[PDB]
């Protein structure tokens with residue numbers, strides 16, 4: 518039951534999402550190995566993901582978390598890159614979308630830096646790069662990221678390298 | 679998936695070496711995220 522609604526580049530909502538995408542690019546310690554070498558993106562399209570059942574699944578859990586945390590969901594907007602982005606928008610996030618080998622255990626990972634999530638578009642470590650050219654720094658092929666509403670609740674703070 | 683640490687709903691990975699990196703986060707229940715925007719893009723070659 519998912520429909521995708523295109524945002525116009527003239528829409529304030531398009532513009533604020535693009536700004537979050539562009540302004541959270543950083544350099545990576547791998548010199549661009551996983552995600553490619555770039556300082557900015559060419560945004561081709563921004564679509565709103567509309568699914569009533571998946572939204573109600575989200576808000577139901579958000580209310581459970583908020584009630585366990587003095588009425589504070591601690592909701593953030595965060596990036597997610599994955600080979601399974603098209604499955605996620607149709608079926609919702611679940612255990613099949615977890616990074617099993619992540620440094621904080623098997624869970625679903627999100628980033629404040631869009632460029633961090635960009636490293637996972639073609640798999641862990643960028644996999645073998647784009648399917649057409651086998652290039653982790655492909656400047657031709659179209660990539661997709663999700664910008665997601667995420668309930669953190671009470672979050673365990675891990676200081677890490 | 680693993681479970682959240684007892685008494686918590688997520689984990690925050692705070693960078694402790696790279697002063698320019700922003701935080702990363704992990705949830706252990708898929709119901710705690712909604713994929714609100716799908717962004718299609720290219721990376722741009724610097725110059």
Ligand SMILES: CCN(CC)c1ccc(-c2nc3ccccc3c(=O)[nH]2)cc1
Nearest residue numbers: 597598599614616626627628634637640
């Ligand atoms: C479930 C598919 N999978 C294995 C290819 C996968 C792995 C990692 C990620 C992922 N990891 C991150 C780690 C830190 C910060 C952000 C992300 C992210 O956006 N995706 C997404 C999907």
Ligand SMILES: [Zn+2]
Nearest residue numbers: 647650655658
């Ligand atoms: Zn390519």
